Design an enzyme around this catalytic site. Sequence first.
Site, PDB file in Angstrom:
ATOM      1  N   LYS A  48       0.835  -1.233   0.000  1.00  0.00           N
ATOM      2  CA  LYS A  48       0.000   0.000   0.000  1.00  0.00           C
ATOM      3  C   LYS A  48       0.855   1.263   0.000  1.00  0.00           C
ATOM      4  O   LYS A  48       0.433   2.310  -0.513  1.00  0.00           O
ATOM      5  CB  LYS A  48      -0.993  -0.032   1.157  1.00  0.00           C
ATOM      6  CG  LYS A  48      -2.172  -1.022   0.853  1.00  0.00           C
ATOM      7  CD  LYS A  48      -2.917  -1.432   2.117  1.00  0.00           C
ATOM      8  CE  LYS A  48      -3.966  -2.508   1.776  1.00  0.00           C
ATOM      9  NZ  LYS A  48      -4.474  -3.217   2.974  1.00  0.00           N
ATOM     10  N   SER A 105      -5.096   0.254   6.756  1.00  0.00           N
ATOM     11  CA  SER A 105      -5.046  -0.970   5.910  1.00  0.00           C
ATOM     12  C   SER A 105      -6.433  -1.294   5.353  1.00  0.00           C
ATOM     13  O   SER A 105      -6.846  -2.469   5.207  1.00  0.00           O
ATOM     14  CB  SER A 105      -4.407  -2.191   6.621  1.00  0.00           C
ATOM     15  OG  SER A 105      -3.640  -2.906   5.663  1.00  0.00           O
ATOM     16  N   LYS A 209       4.458   0.684   7.825  1.00  0.00           N
ATOM     17  CA  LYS A 209       3.286  -0.058   7.319  1.00  0.00           C
ATOM     18  C   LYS A 209       3.555  -1.535   7.552  1.00  0.00           C
ATOM     19  O   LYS A 209       4.632  -2.032   7.222  1.00  0.00           O
ATOM     20  CB  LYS A 209       3.035   0.206   5.831  1.00  0.00           C
ATOM     21  CG  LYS A 209       1.831  -0.577   5.258  1.00  0.00           C
ATOM     22  CD  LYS A 209       0.512   0.104   5.727  1.00  0.00           C
ATOM     23  CE  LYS A 209      -0.726  -0.804   5.541  1.00  0.00           C
ATOM     24  NZ  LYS A 209      -0.866  -1.813   6.648  1.00  0.00           N
ATOM     25  N   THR A 210       2.560  -2.215   8.110  1.00  0.00           N
ATOM     26  CA  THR A 210       2.688  -3.641   8.378  1.00  0.00           C
ATOM     27  C   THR A 210       1.840  -4.451   7.419  1.00  0.00           C
ATOM     28  O   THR A 210       0.984  -3.928   6.720  1.00  0.00           O
ATOM     29  CB  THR A 210       2.323  -4.008   9.841  1.00  0.00           C
ATOM     30  OG1 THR A 210       0.962  -3.653  10.102  1.00  0.00           O
ATOM     31  CG2 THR A 210       3.249  -3.294  10.827  1.00  0.00           C
ATOM     32  N   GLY A 211       2.098  -5.754   7.407  1.00  0.00           N
ATOM     33  CA  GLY A 211       1.342  -6.664   6.556  1.00  0.00           C
ATOM     34  C   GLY A 211       1.283  -8.040   7.181  1.00  0.00           C
ATOM     35  O   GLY A 211       2.140  -8.406   7.982  1.00  0.00           O
TER      36      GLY A 211
HETATM   37  C1  LIG Z   1      -2.392  -6.679   4.874  1.00  0.00           C
HETATM   38  O1  LIG Z   1      -1.324  -7.176   5.207  1.00  0.00           O
HETATM   39  C2  LIG Z   1      -3.750  -7.293   5.147  1.00  0.00           C
HETATM   40  C3  LIG Z   1      -3.663  -8.561   5.939  1.00  0.00           C
HETATM   41  N1  LIG Z   1      -4.780  -9.178   6.299  1.00  0.00           N
HETATM   42  C4  LIG Z   1      -6.088  -8.679   5.842  1.00  0.00           C
HETATM   43  C5  LIG Z   1      -6.367  -9.248   4.441  1.00  0.00           C
HETATM   44  O2  LIG Z   1      -6.893  -8.479   3.610  1.00  0.00           O
HETATM   45  O3  LIG Z   1      -6.044 -10.442   4.217  1.00  0.00           O
HETATM   46  C6  LIG Z   1      -7.188  -9.125   6.833  1.00  0.00           C
HETATM   47  C7  LIG Z   1      -8.563  -8.635   6.361  1.00  0.00           C
HETATM   48  C8  LIG Z   1      -6.895  -8.590   8.250  1.00  0.00           C
HETATM   49  O4  LIG Z   1      -6.622  -7.181   8.222  1.00  0.00           O
HETATM   50  C9  LIG Z   1      -6.415  -6.539   9.413  1.00  0.00           C
HETATM   51  O5  LIG Z   1      -6.607  -7.011  10.535  1.00  0.00           O
HETATM   52  C10 LIG Z   1      -5.887  -5.114   9.262  1.00  0.00           C
HETATM   53  C11 LIG Z   1      -4.377  -5.038   9.531  1.00  0.00           C
HETATM   54  C12 LIG Z   1      -3.587  -5.752   8.425  1.00  0.00           C
HETATM   55  C13 LIG Z   1      -2.066  -5.588   8.634  1.00  0.00           C
HETATM   56  C14 LIG Z   1      -1.547  -6.191   9.959  1.00  0.00           C
HETATM   57  O6  LIG Z   1      -2.134  -7.173  10.470  1.00  0.00           O
HETATM   58  O7  LIG Z   1      -0.521  -5.674  10.427  1.00  0.00           O
HETATM   59  S1  LIG Z   1      -7.252 -11.063   6.909  1.00  0.00           S
HETATM   60  O8  LIG Z   1      -7.982 -11.394   8.202  1.00  0.00           O
HETATM   61  O9  LIG Z   1      -5.826 -11.598   7.042  1.00  0.00           O
END
Ligand SMILES: *C(=O)CCN[C@@H](C(=O)O)[C@](C)(COC(=O)CCCCC(=O)O)S(=O)O
Length: 265
Positions: A48, A105, A209-211
């Site tokens: 992102k 995110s 930014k984390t992922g």
């Molecule tokens: C980005 O790394 C998204 C990771 N996971 C999201 C996805 O779209 O798969 C979901 C929806 C979870 O998103 C979050 O909890 C928001 C933070 C995301 C980044 C982080 O955890 O640091 S799915 O449940 O994996």
Amino acid sequence: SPQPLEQIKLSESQLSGRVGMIEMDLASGRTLTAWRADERFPMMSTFKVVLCGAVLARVDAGDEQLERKIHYRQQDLVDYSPVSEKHLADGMTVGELCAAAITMSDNSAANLLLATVGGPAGLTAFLRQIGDNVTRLDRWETELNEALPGDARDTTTPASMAATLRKLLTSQRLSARSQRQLLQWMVDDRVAGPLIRSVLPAGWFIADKTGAGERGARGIVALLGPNNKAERIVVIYLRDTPASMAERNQQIAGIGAALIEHWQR
Ligand SMILES: *C(=O)CCN[C@@H](C(=O)O)[C@](C)(COC(=O)CCCCC(=O)O)S(=O)O
Ligand SMILES: OC[C@H]1O[C@H](O[C@H]2[C@H](O)[C@@H](O)[C@H](OCCCCCCC3CCCCC3)O[C@@H]2CO)[C@H](O)[C@@H](O)[C@@H]1O
């Protein structure tokens, strides 16, 4: 803590996963620590930041405005849209969409922005234009963080991502205002920023930014440094570990502690 490399190795032993890591001076690009830095890892939501770099490049060229309001439909929304689901009636500006994508995110916001830059193909072409010949986006949210073993889609390397972040933040490819904006979005991360601050010693700057993804995929792209300065880019990716999210967080924090304790290298 042990030295940074010792700690990275321990993390792989304790996670049974691959860690990839670059520590780089932001101002010069001096590489301090490099571990599996040319190996592929899923970007997950860290893409992102690159995405909004491509948006800002369009703004600089006069082909986009951060003010421009985008209206969208409920049927357009994907999983995890904490900001964008609130604005079905009124829309969001391109700048608001980048703030939502980077700081929250928000996945629909990211997909809306991705369309404006020509989709995964368009963003990859942007990466090629700035001299990143490695990083690639192939899919949209939310399929892009599937992290299948041996799958090159939606990947970067620690070295490529750190170089690309440095290019966007410092190299004058983006205008001064755009560089400042991209930095401020990372400073404003709400997902991990406050949590990281809570465990950082007084005096340490963080922007990030984390992922996260499947099969234990986890990552962070960050600016870090003492004296309240963004001294270094730190990119850490993990893949192919069965560990809990909490343990993946703790191991990444452990690498951070090693850097903090042994900063002068
Ligand atoms: C980005 O790394 C998204 C990771 N996971 C999201 C996805 O779209 O798969 C979901 C929806 C979870 O998103 C979050 O909890 C928001 C933070 C995301 C980044 C982080 O955890 O640091 S799915 O449940 O994996
Ligand atoms: O001597 C150095 C410091 O050692 C400790 O600080 C600890 C701190 O109490 C702990 O919470 C943190 O955990 C590490 C938390 C790092 C957070 C994530 C790091 C990110 C940042 C950039 C991307 C990579 C990971 O370690 C440091 C160093 O041992 C002392 O508490 C502190 O008073 C002292 O100034």
